[PDB]
């Protein structure tokens, strides 16, 4: 049961809230839906100080915005990079330069991201 640990922990939280607000409803289904509302929007604290609804809204909105931003960035790029890595000093083919940093560069090769120091790479425009 430790594989799906999140839903068992949420079972414990939902049962504690159901035992907290049981005396305000008649049936058990109304108490279940009220416990869902109390857990979703009336309990703060966690990663960013959010509740659950603000956190799921922030996660999906940030995912969509960063996909659109990196598409519009990467569609107009240049400056191919030939780099040298491995146990033997071989040379690999055309890779895409992502970010030029003071100490290392980020390359994309075969849809795989790697960090290569600036001593073992050369940029061709």
């Amino acid at each position: 049961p430790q594989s799906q640990g999140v839903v068992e922990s949420m079972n414990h939280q939902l049962k504690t809230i159901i035992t907290q607000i049981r005396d305000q409803a008649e049936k058990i289904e109304t108490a279940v839906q009220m416990a869902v509302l109390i857990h979703n929007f009336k309990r703060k604290g966690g990663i960013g100080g959010y509740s659950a609804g603000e956190r799921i809204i922030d996660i999906i909105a940030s995912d969509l915005q960063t996909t659109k931003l990196q598409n519009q960035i990467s569609k107009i790029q240049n400056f191919r990079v030939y780099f040298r890595e491995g146990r033997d000093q071989q040379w690999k083919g055309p890779a895409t330069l992502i970010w030029k940093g003071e100490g290392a560069v980020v390359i994309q090769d075969g849809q795989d991201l790697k960090v290569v120091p600036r001593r073992k790479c050369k940029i061709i425009k």
Partner: peptide
């Protein structure tokens, strides 16, 4: 992630969005 539990002889079913902690539940 999804699971089912028991309470007062009823069968609750819980689905949770993992990366935020978002709970949907039904009977």
């Amino acid at each position: 992630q999804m699971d089912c539990t028991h309470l007062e002889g009823k069968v609750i079913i819980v689905a949770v969005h993992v990366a935020s902690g978002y709970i949907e539940a039904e009977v």
